Ligand SMILES: NC(=O)c1ccc[n+]([C@@H]2O[C@H](COP(=O)([O-])OP(=O)(O)OC[C@H]3O[C@@H](n4cnc5c(N)ncnc54)[C@H](OP(=O)(O)O)[C@@H]3O)[C@@H](O)[C@H]2O)c1
């Protein structure tokens with residue numbers, strides 16, 4: 001399948017000129033657990049923001065331009081990105097906004113972290129058609145020493 005994973009603040013904000021507005025290590029740890037040993041597809045701006053390869057995962061970068069780093073795989077279209085992933089039980093699409101929009105209709109599963117934080121962003125998760133998704137997992141966490149906002153991990157499956 002194809003699955004999207006994202007962390008959403010209020011109103012589906014996911015970023016602000018190429019930095020995430022927070023630092024919730026419980027959520028990054030959820031991200032790592034759900035992506036480790038799977039291929040991850042990302043757009044070029046998200047590659048830039050991370051700033052390095054994600055270890056333990058096949059990193060596939062979409063760009064309409066030649067690639068500039070041979071430590072990751074560069075592809076020029078959605079069909080090529082999926083093909084580069086070969087024979088894998090689960091393909092993880094890790095954003096950003098433009099990439100999420102294109103992979104949504106080919107997604108079976110959404111791993112969403114809803115963060116209770118108010119932030120004034122420039123990129124959104126495409127979100128919304130609720131009727132087409134069943135929530136099968138939801139786990140809510142209050143803020144603590146390490147994590148300054150409350151947040152909820154949710155897994156949705158396409159009905
Ligand atoms: N909250 C979260 O979980 C999360 C997750 C990921 C990212 N983010 C944030 O999202 C923001 C980045 O998102 P974004 O929407 O600006 O950019 P993006 O989706 O990461 O990257 C867009 C770029 O990817 C390339 N691309 C996308 N689809 C393509 C296709 N079918 N074929 C060829 N190339 C394609 C293009 O590169 P070229 O311009 O090189 O052609 C395009 O400019 C940042 O703020 C980031 O921190 C947040």
Ligand SMILES: Nc1nc(=O)c2nc(CNc3ccc(C(=O)N[C@@H](CCC(=O)O)C(=O)O)cc3)cnc2[nH]1
Pocket residue numbers: 005006007020027028029030031032046050053054055094095112113
């Ligand atoms: N749930 C979720 N949360 C996010 O913060 C997130 N971020 C991105 C894009 N940004 C990033 C930034 C860093 C790393 C990274 O290298 N993560 C480490 C865990 C430690 C950490 O991120 O601080 C990893 O090895 O996965 C991945 C994606 C994509 N999907 C997400 N999904």
Ligand SMILES: [Mn+2]
Pocket residue numbers: 116117118148149150
């Ligand atoms: Mn808050």
Ligand SMILES: [Mn+2]
Pocket residue numbers: 110111112154155156
């Ligand atoms: Mn979900």
